[model samples]
Target: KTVRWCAVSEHEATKCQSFRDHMKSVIPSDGPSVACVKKASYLDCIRAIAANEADAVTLDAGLVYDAYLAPNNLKPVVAEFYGSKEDPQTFYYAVAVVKKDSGFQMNQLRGKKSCHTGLGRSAGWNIPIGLLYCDLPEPRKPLEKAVANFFSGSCAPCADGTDFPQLCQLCPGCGCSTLNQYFGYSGAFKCLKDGAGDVAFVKHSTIFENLANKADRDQYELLCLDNTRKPVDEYKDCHLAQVPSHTVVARSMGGKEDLIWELLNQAQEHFGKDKSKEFQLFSSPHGKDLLFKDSAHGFLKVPPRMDAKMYLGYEYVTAIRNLREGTCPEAPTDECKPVKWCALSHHERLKCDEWSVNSVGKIECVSAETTEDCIAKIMNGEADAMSLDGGFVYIAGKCGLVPVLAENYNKSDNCEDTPEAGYFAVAVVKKSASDLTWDNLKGKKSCHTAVGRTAGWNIPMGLLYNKINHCRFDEFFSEGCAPGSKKDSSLCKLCMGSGLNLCEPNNKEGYYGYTGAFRCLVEKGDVAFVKHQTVPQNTGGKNPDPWAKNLNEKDYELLCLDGTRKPVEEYANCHLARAPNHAVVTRKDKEACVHKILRQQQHLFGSNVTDCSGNFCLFRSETKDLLFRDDTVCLAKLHDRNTYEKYLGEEYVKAVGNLRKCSTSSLLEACTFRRP
Candidate 1:
């Protein structure tokens, strides 16, 4: 009986064949015969593990690890031997080689072009590349420079920009034609000897020993570069030698596990023998524990702690269980009310009113009549809470107001199981307001609803304070307010009077307020008000009139406290419609309500809904093959003209038209989808 084995490359195949021939002469005829050798790439050997083409494969340990260890296919039986006596233990060290008279120094070769075989070969590629790029003097600098140079040039030696190429040197007579295209024949010693070039690089040990037998051995000089640094020591010299391991991987469908074990045992006995100095083999234990324990170098290692019951270990398993049961520590409460939220000016009452129908609690509007009234109501223990724009929230929070919630709400960015909730403060001014400044707003009449208000005041005011003072609210307040003295009333006085002003009918020069309603501030020109983006579009059936709608399209300038607005032409300003700025909140004490609201929202919305769009659908395939599948479903009806005009404004229509003109096919695909 003969056992056929496959090798990764022609060189490996030749070596295996030679070893087999030598073993046949030594082993008894009654034992398994060592016969023909099949040649394939290292990757092909991995494929054979799936196809059951070969019983064993001779290749790099890392390559085997990547294939069998990663997907769970193979195990190591024995490593290759290279001594008069089979020691059954071996390891190979990598070395760098250069022409004796070459002007290149190790450091000077940084960012230079070099050659090597593919990644599967150990001595040919990975070892040398890893040594040069990661184990040299000032490793990071040379590596970065080399990568940059590699990407900038055409016909560069580095095929992948991340790989270091100038350090690689492939085997001679490997017939790697693709490599010649980059470094040319002069880059390879065999090519040079064949009149292709003047010099080549080879394995350090083989070259050194081969030179000893040649008359021109004196002409070749090997220089030892010092890399005494912690990681660089391994590749600095190439004197070490050990037998490289081979693996026997079983296919997923095959029941040849027992046969593989038997073959490995027999192969070991046959290779473990005294032979001439040229070739030899070594064998060791072939059980799973031994295979996995000693296989780390060539293949991926299975952690010894892993077992049948706890394959992924306790921590990972616990995390997965928590995720499945919705019991993770990070999981959101399942009950809560859909607190009403909105983003509108004082003059925009009708819009807020229109939005109120869908909300459980009203996020109070900010304006002349409403600003002072709403804040006073909350301060006097009347109203439960209020909302403010990002900018106003920042300022108010800094001016001694406690912000129960800020504008960090990013619900659309999260999954149903992990819904996001928070807020980010924003400043509101005329889209034309460009002179606003922090300095101007300081000690100026500024208006807000109340402390602890989420959007209408707290969030915006906090952001303003942070931006203007370049310090956090807690730090500023702690420093400004005396330890025993009352909270800094001066800051509040400045913002409420001199630094800011209410947007009242009698006071046209003030910076803030809610008059008739929150939307009325923007609609009636009482004052330019800042508020949250997640504020509802309608509340209490009081919708913003047509005039407020018209104002939204006119590009009222947004002014920072210093009266500066970001460049309107930037994508950041234009894409603001894509994200939400408001969040739903319940009283902190109402934990059960919060959980209920969270569960209802996730269940109804399917957790994939992000932004203002309320659409949910999934697609399924009818055919077995992907290309032939022809099933579709509609997640949501196409946005009608009225809906588009209301939410996105006319600019969206124009943007869509431009995209359609550029690529109709892409436009159609983006806008249309089938659901199953």
Candidate 2:
């Protein structure tokens, strides 16, 4: 919604001008007239925005960075909000995906060929480069030098082989421009498909769009920092960072950002796929979303007049800089102190012991009954560090602990990043229950995995609060099993709490984790609140749970915001907000020790290890993400450089905090009561 003009770069002018003509035909006379403006190139387009010669243009991520570097001073006016029938976001999480069968392992990335959307794009260049530099000794070296040394070669379109030979070595020996066949999203995917590169780094949807075969889907995976891989589609739980998608940028002082919005929205209303087939607003017969992403559903407005950096958000901006030049906030220090890592479960305890034995030089791991128990021990100085889900991470931080590493279900470079780079929160229902919808959720038999977990409680309950206008959800649900709820309340009316641990945080409880909630939905309850993948992963005998042995993925459906149901894969277009990644928390003073130990822990048993002789897995476990997401690929450094407020985006913290007043988590209360 950031422009009223089809401000195409001169090279793409005519092909793009057709879009303007189409917009003119579709828009009503009552609406402001749309116009076509031409520029010599992306730089010329930037000049147009600055000189007020054009109202809008879509620039690459690096160009956005360049525009922010003074004289150009253009502001991003809109970002594509990805999903939801009602409310949609202005950004999407971009990630790096790789085929598991490829020779590449996250640990052995140094000698692999890479693929890119373009030379200076965010996911293709900035994120991965900065992530690679985090492990190196010298970050001040040119990013191209670090990349050339780290990657055997790459297919970057805007880099010249003669000047930066190593960086360009992987390309098809073509010109360093977009005209190169190995440039853009499709070209990047083709790089991976053609086996020209070991990894393809781009947006989350790149693989799905390129690979339509059902069989080919399972063969690919996303490469994460801990150096392991997950199904490529699990981006919300396995990605770099939530970045502002392609933007419609304009001059901060003069552009018609709002007019652009009306024009685009009107065009969509008139010529969108659902509206008119005569002219498609986002499709192009040539290649992709010719002007905008061909896959974009619709446009969403960006915050008012924020320049490129602000529009990109702080972590993303820092990530772009870090990826381009390199950033080393912390490096491996020889003064390695053994951090007393806290394990929240027996499984974690056994693994921690093995991790300690192998990483004996750096980490001294410990154990506790639950995350709350681990927090208590850390507060009492009995332990130094522990992995925590989003809910508990908040409590640990409130009690004066600090986030050292984020159990990033997704990927990211900085220690300071938003919770948006996490997993999808969703509600699973039986496909047989066509009568169910969000509006009719009240008074139904419901099931929650845990009281404080992001998907289980905070997300659904947040929506419920806005609707019901009350904190007491117990009365709203006729019968339910919210595992971590207070045992005596009606909220626990359906709970099966026992003696010593009335409402425990483990699988012993009937509603304990993703599998448990899904179990409730399949057998005991009408609906399950969990991550989007929970239903698909646990059902159809895909889970470790015996109760889920006969569960079928085809029998399930997700409740969308519009109160309708959709198949599981439709989560990208029908979901609650992206949940924050689970994280590891520790005392601020133990940063150096904890950081050193965990980094070594990853090298030993993290994701890169081909054999487990001296190491053990930190991610995969007998249960669902105990002390850490079992689905976790690796822990991203969430170094103390981030503020508690910024780390978990304010809107997220606010929504989750609201649940403390109603949900059954004592830790939630402790965190919420103290947050103010």
Candidate 3:
């Protein structure tokens, strides 16, 4: 097979020709070869690849995003690494640069003459414009119009001079290419240094690269998000956003990625950096960043899970999305309609608020006092969706809600794998309680997450349903703390809620959720029923709470079904039962919208993001189970199992049904009979 390289310029064509010529000498006589397809621009090359006239091309994150959309469905298969081999960097920060003595902040950029790399580029146009004019107060105008008005004069290369003449007024030449002196990072910086503009919007490394002298570089400062500024070296803290580097993109549907990766991998090994003198794979003799980034150290293969949107990351993609429609705080379209999410606790509502702001208001939060309240809101159309435990899924199902997505805790981190989609329910006890086994727990104090949750209540209690004379766990365990149990019952004796919230089925109850129940075992209860991940999550310094500060993972053991005690890590082999994972549920008509909003939300706030450091995380809430479970890896799509019964499986559904036989839920009974 022959792989074609799409070249965007004459210099790029020459570089690709050299690449093609070098590949011929290295490959076996019968192995795959390379061909160069010359095009006028990056967009033309993208068109060529889309029509099968060419195979692959390396594009910046902004262009990769464009190529991923519409008729051209390209996927990023390889990434160009920068920095050093020991610590390679595949991303860079977009910064706003101004003279240190200018004495202006980020918010004061209005009416200032600005310098930018080019139109439609990430660090230059999209990020800065999105941050500056994302929220226009007037009737929705295009971002270009708002930017044209925001800046009295600017240099945004490749912009149509006739449509926005003031933008191109300061340029040495109005041309979009390098022929214009103000076309790229160094060019924009040059525009600032030459006193043509007040500020230059560029990447973090621009000042260091442009001004070789340290004192000269120190003349510039980066505008901080907090309305302050810092020296150029502190761009890490002062930049607008970090965006992904250039990537080799090809057709998403075809087998092109395999061949494309093979070719790039071999090319990099043969001629990358100091590997060979015959040719420089990353170097261009005639121009800068011709076929690839000239400063890239080498290439790293992109993971199959990363589509263009994922590779570009959520923040960068959101910036571009807002830039495209000038969308922030106004006028809703059919695609922009908000999805109302039901939140259970105070922390869940706070996280939901941050999520709504970060999602550009696509998701709105409606708070409730409890899970049942949230479920009722979703069922009655007061809210659209919420993630529910498997037992609650059964309740919501009876109320006419269907499962839309399932929470995955798989080891592979792949969202689609169905095996072991559930976590093991284990009975965790302190190592000091050496004689407490599963079989002889006749008069021990117990701790559970809540009365109706899956691992904490349904799974552990269901396994002992026939053994315990009736559904009365209070008799079997002399004293216990099940959050939702009756306040005066023996089950609530071990509960440690603050004041009036005693034995409440919420985070307010100190001995409530997984961590809290585990705390119950550590402090008072003999055994705590929780998911397998609970011990590891709360011990070994993973948790910094006062009670669990010195607790170690080795100090806990799981009480097995056969009455044997094993280390907490052995829950896979010695556990009570595996229960279905938590899943997002909604009414039939609202399913698609809820799933769509959540899918978009995950791209930004989900667990897989590498840059959510100190930012809002969708699956985390200071160890509290908020809108979604903290242990969740991803919101996995259900494979033809949209119904609650199908998603929970027959065995789990039957187990939950059997447990409910002894204590039927009043809320479930109310919803089941009221609708039909």
lDDT of 2 by residue, 289-336 (tens): 566776667776654624465455433555666655654646454566
TM-score of each: 0.25, 0.44, 0.47
Candidate 3 clash pair list:
none
lDDT of 1 by residue, 151-173 (tens): 22222233443454323322333
RMSD of each: 26.8, 16.6, 18.6
Tell me the lDDT of candidate 3.
0.80
What are the runs in model 3 whose C-alpha is more than 4 Å off? 8-18, 24-32, 35-41, 98-108, 112-122, 130-148, 152-198, 209-221, 224-238, 283-290, 318-676
Error of 2 at 388 (Å): 16
lDDT of 3 by residue, 299-332 (tens): 8776664466656643466677776655565455
Q: Give the Cα error of residue 61 in candidate 3, in Å.
A: 3.3
Q: lDDT scores for all predictions?
A: 0.35, 0.68, 0.80
Q: Give me the candidate number with maximum TM-score.
A: 3
Off by more than 4 A, model 2: 1-6, 9-30, 35-37, 80-94, 98-108, 111-127, 133-146, 152-221, 226-229, 241-245, 252-255, 274-297, 303-307, 310-319, 323-676
On lDDT, the leading prediction is: 3
lDDT of 2: 0.68
